[PDB]
Enzyme design. Structure first.
Site, PDB file in Angstrom:
ATOM      1  N   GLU A 163       4.648  30.166 -56.866  1.00 21.65           N
ATOM      2  CA  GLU A 163       5.448  31.283 -57.336  1.00 21.65           C
ATOM      3  C   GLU A 163       6.017  31.020 -58.710  1.00 21.65           C
ATOM      4  O   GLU A 163       5.998  31.918 -59.554  1.00 21.65           O
ATOM      5  CB  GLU A 163       6.570  31.624 -56.337  1.00 21.65           C
ATOM      6  CG  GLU A 163       6.028  32.328 -55.097  1.00 21.65           C
ATOM      7  CD  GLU A 163       5.618  33.764 -55.324  1.00 21.65           C
ATOM      8  OE1 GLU A 163       6.004  34.361 -56.362  1.00 21.65           O
ATOM      9  OE2 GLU A 163       4.971  34.389 -54.433  1.00 21.65           O
ATOM     10  N   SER A 222       2.767  37.854 -52.742  1.00 23.81           N
ATOM     11  CA  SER A 222       3.444  37.131 -51.666  1.00 23.81           C
ATOM     12  C   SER A 222       2.651  37.090 -50.367  1.00 23.81           C
ATOM     13  O   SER A 222       3.018  36.303 -49.483  1.00 23.81           O
ATOM     14  CB  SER A 222       4.821  37.702 -51.342  1.00 23.81           C
ATOM     15  OG  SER A 222       5.791  37.445 -52.362  1.00 23.81           O
TER      16      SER A 222
HETATM   17  C1  LIG Z   1       5.952  38.513 -53.280  1.00 24.65           C
HETATM   18  O1  LIG Z   1       4.992  39.238 -53.518  1.00 24.65           O
HETATM   19  N1  LIG Z   1       7.031  38.506 -53.924  1.00 24.65           N
HETATM   20  C2  LIG Z   1       8.216  37.857 -53.405  1.00 24.65           C
HETATM   21  C3  LIG Z   1       9.267  38.902 -53.119  1.00 24.65           C
HETATM   22  N2  LIG Z   1       8.918  39.701 -51.925  1.00 24.65           N
HETATM   23  O2  LIG Z   1       8.414  40.897 -52.144  1.00 24.65           O
HETATM   24  S1  LIG Z   1       7.573  41.469 -50.997  1.00 24.65           S
HETATM   25  O3  LIG Z   1       8.491  42.310 -50.295  1.00 24.65           O
HETATM   26  O4  LIG Z   1       6.509  42.341 -51.352  1.00 24.65           O
HETATM   27  O5  LIG Z   1       6.816  40.160 -50.381  1.00 24.65           O
HETATM   28  C4  LIG Z   1       9.531  39.671 -54.406  1.00 24.65           C
HETATM   29  C5  LIG Z   1       8.272  40.295 -54.958  1.00 24.65           C
HETATM   30  C6  LIG Z   1       7.148  39.306 -55.136  1.00 24.65           C
HETATM   31  C7  LIG Z   1       7.336  38.534 -56.396  1.00 24.65           C
HETATM   32  N3  LIG Z   1       7.420  39.278 -57.503  1.00 24.65           N
HETATM   33  O6  LIG Z   1       7.528  37.332 -56.389  1.00 24.65           O
END
Ligand SMILES: *C(=O)N1C[C@H](NOS(=O)(=O)O)CC[C@H]1C(N)=O
Ligand SMILES: *C(=O)N1C[C@H](NOS(=O)(=O)O)CC[C@H]1C(N)=O
Ligand SMILES: [Cl-]
Ligand SMILES: [Cl-]
Ligand SMILES: [Cl-]
Ligand SMILES: [Cl-]
Ligand code: NA
Ligand code: NA
Ligand code: NA
Ligand code: NA
Ligand code: NA
Ligand code: NA
Ligand code: NA
Ligand code: NA
Ligand code: NA
Ligand code: NA
Ligand code: NA
Ligand code: NA
Ligand code: NA
Ligand code: NA
Ligand code: NA
Ligand code: NA
Ligand code: NA
Ligand code: NA
Ligand code: NA
Ligand code: NA
Ligand code: NA
Ligand code: NA
Ligand code: NA
Ligand code: NA
Ligand code: NA
Ligand code: NA
Ligand code: NA
Ligand code: NA
Ligand code: NA
Ligand code: NA
Ligand code: NA
Ligand code: NA
Ligand code: NA
Ligand code: NA
Lengths: 275, 275
Positions: free
Chosen positions: B145, B45
């Site tokens: 994503e 992210s």
């Molecule tokens: C990003 O890495 N993601 C989106 C979401 N936020 O988590 S964070 O707090 O580390 O940015 C969930 C985890 C992750 C994903 N698995 O999509």
């Protein structure tokens, strides 16, 4: 008549690239309809209903008030999963009531709340057995949310037949499982569900009461969405009720179509029962 | 002195079962520290920072106000992903401002908001090129994503070196990329971040300003967590700033340890720079 409704649903399903399991059971009367019911469908988040039953039973039996609080560690609120609780409490490390945790887990399908409650109740095997001992066969509870997120296939270990689901929903609605207070609490929590509003509820009249729990999978690299589900009890305009469960599984269709399958099948059943 | 801090961090990392990339760059002065920086780390992210830069540039250049609104379809709010927007607006099909969408995407790491914005800005390749043309090499933006959630390996296509990240963060902090208003907006949004409070921020004094963006992966069936990351700009007690990026990758350690690695490395850097 019931046979005719069945044939209509089967015809609707002819050109949908998915394996769709359907069951309906009247609550007060003898109405019964099954489609593709002998298959095993992945439950995904719909098994949080079953989890909530086992949890509230445990609280009932052991005389633990639902307002009592668990300490929810930061590590109990994992980041890579759907979790309104985590966004609400990003530091975790706080006391939350069973009530609050169950409402998030069921009405908002929180995955962390689900696994916190699996740990409280004593694991997936406890919940599997609890359900089996209600006299409902053909439900398998094997894996937590964390376990399902580790690998694509693990979701299929948490499977059901659709008729099992509505058998269970009917035992529940007739308050054959819980105390009055816990029943009231879980039922209200299922009406308060905010997820899946274009699934069972999608094409029903505004304001129809639908006590329900949804579930969804992701889509794999082959374009298959394993599960798009909605299960619940619906109130008719004359106060009577039906339990319905729809599992759109292993679908090549896009998400809008998968939801629409549920909405249209439900509408068909609704239209038959109101007439 | 800087060499000594480096040796301390390397010694800390000796018994941690993970590949940890670290970069630090002073904003106003010449301070520079890199650890394990020639590897490619999965961003997860953290690339929503880069996305936000490209989006706000597009709005700046094309004279589109951040208060203008996109129509967010229900299908733009997918269920099997982390998404505060979806829980806020479960029916979707509504107008949301770029401002609201960006704040959710960056401060709360919404995955649906991320992909809505990738679509608005013209895709992952647009954002990849935008970043490259700022003069920052060693960043690869390839997958949305939704695309990452389809298969375990896809996250590694969205990779970075840690020194690239802090080079970019420094260009940004000195407002070399955006309009004043967009800079102010993105910076405020990064300070307002609620995720990862036990990462870069974890062991710093209460109230330290940390403008940051986190990222996390899941853990696979072998017990490996691909990514636990935090990147940002930190304000020292004397108003000066440093950019820091930490990527804990391919880790066999549990999530509490992965976060603690970030917190402890950051604390070490903080303690050196305040002294
Ligand atoms: C990003 O890495 N993601 C989106 C979401 N936020 O988590 S964070 O707090 O580390 O940015 C969930 C985890 C992750 C994903 N698995 O999509
Ligand atoms: C349950 O199936 N899940 C939890 C959450 N809620 O979705 S729901 O609206 O269908 O219950 C996200 C999807 C899913 C999961 N992937 O964990
Ligand atoms: Cl999820
Ligand atoms: Cl009951
Ligand atoms: Cl996610
Ligand atoms: Cl800038
Ligand atoms: Na079918
Ligand atoms: Na009935
Ligand atoms: Na059956
Ligand atoms: Na948390
Ligand atoms: Na509480
Ligand atoms: Na509380
Ligand atoms: Na709730
Ligand atoms: Na058990
Ligand atoms: Na089990
Ligand atoms: Na069973
Ligand atoms: Na799975
Ligand atoms: Na059955
Ligand atoms: Na509802
Ligand atoms: Na609903
Ligand atoms: Na819906
Ligand atoms: Na789905
Ligand atoms: Na699909
Ligand atoms: Na390392
Ligand atoms: Na500086
Ligand atoms: Na490098
Ligand atoms: Na929605
Ligand atoms: Na808005
Ligand atoms: Na709006
Ligand atoms: Na927000
Ligand atoms: Na593109
Ligand atoms: Na690309
Ligand atoms: Na680059
Ligand atoms: Na991936
Ligand atoms: Na580099
Ligand atoms: Na912050
Ligand atoms: Na934070
Ligand atoms: Na944290
Ligand atoms: Na992680
Ligand atoms: Na791990």
């Amino acid at each position: 008549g019931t046979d005719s409704l069945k044939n209509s649903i089967e015809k609707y399903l002819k050109d949908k690239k998915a394996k769709v399991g359907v069951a309906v059971l009247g609550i007060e009367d003898n109405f019964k309809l099954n489609v593709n019911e002998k298959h095993h469908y992945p439950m995904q988040s719909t098994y949080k209903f079953h989890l909530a039953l086992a949890v509230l039973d445990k609280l009932d039996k052991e005389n633990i008030s639902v307002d009592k609080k668990l300490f929810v560690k930061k590590s109990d609120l994992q980041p890579n999963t759907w979790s309104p609780l985590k966004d609400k409490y990003p530091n975790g490390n706080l006391e939350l009531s069973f009530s609050e945790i169950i409402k998030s887990t069921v009405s908002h399908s929180d995955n962390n709340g689900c696994d916190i409650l699996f740990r409280f109740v004593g694991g997936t095997n406890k919940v599997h057995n609890f359900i089996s001992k209600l006299g409902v066969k053909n439900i398998s509870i094997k894996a937590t949310e964390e376990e399902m997120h580790k690998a694509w296939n693990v979701q299929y270990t948490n499977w059901t037949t659709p008729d099992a689901t509505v058998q269970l929903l009917k035992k529940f609605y007739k308050n054959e499982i819980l105390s009055k207070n816990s029943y009231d609490f879980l039922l209200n929590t299922m009406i308060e569900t905010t997820t899946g509003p274009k699934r069972l509820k999608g094409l029903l009249p505004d304001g129809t009461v639908v006590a329900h729990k949804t579930g969804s999978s992701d889509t794999n690299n082959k374009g298959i969405t394993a599960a798009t589900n909605d299960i619940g009890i619906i109130t008719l305009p004359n106060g009577k009720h039906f339990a319905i469960a729809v599992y759109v599984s292993d679908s090549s269709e896009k998400s809008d179509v998968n939801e629409k399958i549920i909405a249209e099948i439900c509408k068909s059943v609704w239209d038959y029962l109101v007439k």
